Amino acid sequence: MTEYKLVVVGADGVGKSALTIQLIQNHFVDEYDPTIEDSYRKQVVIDGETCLLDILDTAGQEEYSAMRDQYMRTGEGFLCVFAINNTKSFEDIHHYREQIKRVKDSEDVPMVLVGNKCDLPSRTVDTKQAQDLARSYGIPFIETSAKTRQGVDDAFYTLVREIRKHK
Ligand SMILES: Nc1nc2c(ncn2[C@@H]2O[C@H](COP(=O)(O)OP(=O)(O)CP(=O)(O)O)[C@@H](O)[C@H]2O)c(=O)[nH]1
Numbered sequence: 816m817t818e819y820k821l822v823v824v825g826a827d828g829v830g831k832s833a834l835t836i837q838l839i840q841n842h843f844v845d846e847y848d849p850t851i852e853d854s855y856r857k858q859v860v861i862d863g864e865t866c867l868l869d870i871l872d873t874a875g876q877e878e879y880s881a882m883r884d885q886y887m888r889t890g891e892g893f894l895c896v897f898a899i900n901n902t903k904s905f906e907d908i909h910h911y912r913e914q915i916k917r918v919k920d921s922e923d924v925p926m927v928l929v930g931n932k933c934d935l936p937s938r939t940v941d942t943k944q945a946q947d948l949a950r951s952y953g954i955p956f957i958e959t960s961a962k963t964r965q966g967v968d969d970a971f972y973t974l975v976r977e978i979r980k981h982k
């Protein structure tokens with residue numbers, strides 16, 4: 816059975832846990848409970864292949880920033896999440912990407928840029944600007960909503976395809 820080690824990263828509050836819980840449990844968490852580190856092992860069929868997804872839901876709190884090298888070494892693909900209503904979270908993306916590239920000593924690590932909270936009207940990050948950043952990295956970009964489930968399956972399945980396409 817093919818196993819994929821997915822790691823969800825991004826700033827504190829972007830919706831990493833809500834995205835993961837929506838993918839796995841099909842419901843939206845309204846409450847904000849800061850994550851330390853949670854892991855899920857889930858079986859899914861993607862493109863006719865039975866996949867075992869090992870999903871690591873990480874801490875966005877900068878206080879847990881020394882925990883990152885370990886999961887960056889074991890992780891095969893990274894869901895780099897920002898929120899479309901949080902400009903700082905979009906600027907933090909580059910720091911996450913650089914750190915991943917350094918830990919794995921590679922310019923070609925499977926990644927997907929995710930612009931979450933697309934259900935909200937308070938956008939501060941233009942879709943075109945996010946698309947241009949993803950293009951500069953050579954990675955896919957998808958907008959998602961952990962609330963409506965828009966783009967959620969596509970974001971995780973695209974990351975699996977990036978790990979598989981890189982393999
Ligand atoms: N409207 C809307 N709210 C969202 C969405 N995703 C998450 N949220 C909300 O944002 C807040 C933080 O979500 P959460 O999933 O805990 O973010 P996180 O990135 O895991 C926080 P931490 O880094 O500390 O673990 C919660 O109030 C949650 O309901 C979304 O797509 N749309």
Ligand SMILES: [Mg+2]
Nearest residue numbers: 831832849850
């Ligand atoms: Mg969380």
